[PDB]
Amino acid sequence: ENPVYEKKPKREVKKKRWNRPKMSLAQKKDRVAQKKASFLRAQERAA
RNA sequence: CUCGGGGGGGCCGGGCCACCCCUCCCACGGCGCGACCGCUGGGGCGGACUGUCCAGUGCGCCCCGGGCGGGUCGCGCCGUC
């Protein structure tokens, strides 16, 4: 009788982000620097 | 002027270049200033994350400021047989 499809009406939604974005080169570079400082810092404490 | 023959100066008008002042535009090059794009320390807020010391790194919006680069445009000045 009526096979047509009435598309569900789109609604504007609050812009929300549900997953992390890629870490930047600077952040990835700093993290290595922080990790290296932490490793030696621990080694000095042990001694 | 020289022996009718021979050698010369010419005839008055216009505009142009050299002389002296300014003066319009264009092109090229240089110096100085401004507007817009436009390469890239701070401050405020929001957030996401990182580090086996509380410290640190991006991202978003906005407000600055520096180094000082170029591109477009607008000027002022200087140079050009």
UniProtKB/Swiss-Prot annotation:
Function recorded in the entry: Component of the ribosome, a large ribonucleoprotein complex responsible for the synthesis of proteins in the cell. The small ribosomal subunit (SSU) binds messenger RNAs (mRNAs) and translates the encoded message by selecting cognate aminoacyl-transfer RNA (tRNA) molecules. The large subunit (LSU) contains the ribosomal catalytic site termed the peptidyl transferase center (PTC), which catalyzes the formation of peptide bonds, thereby polymerizing the amino acids delivered by tRNAs into a polypeptide chain.
Gene name of the record: RPL5
Domain of life (superkingdom): Eukaryota
Record region (Disordered): 5-47
Family listed: Belongs to the universal ribosomal protein uL18 family.
Residue span relative to the full protein: 249 to 295 of 297
Protein name as catalogued: Large ribosomal subunit protein uL18
Subunit record text: Component of the large ribosomal subunit (LSU). Part of the 5S RNP complex, which is a LSU subcomplex composed of the 5S RNA, RPL5 and RPL11. Component of a hexameric 5S RNP precursor complex, composed of 5S RNA, RRS1, RPF2/BXDC1, RPL5, RPL11 and HEATR3; this complex acts as a precursor for ribosome assembly. Interacts with isoform 1 of NVL in an ATP-dependent manner. Interacts with RRP1B. Interacts with IPO5, IPO7 and KPNB1; these interactions may be involved in RPL5 nuclear import for the assembly of ribosomal subunits.
Residues annotated with Phosphoserine modification: 24
Compartmental location: Cytoplasm; Nucleus, Nucleolus
Basic residues compositional bias, start-end: 10-20
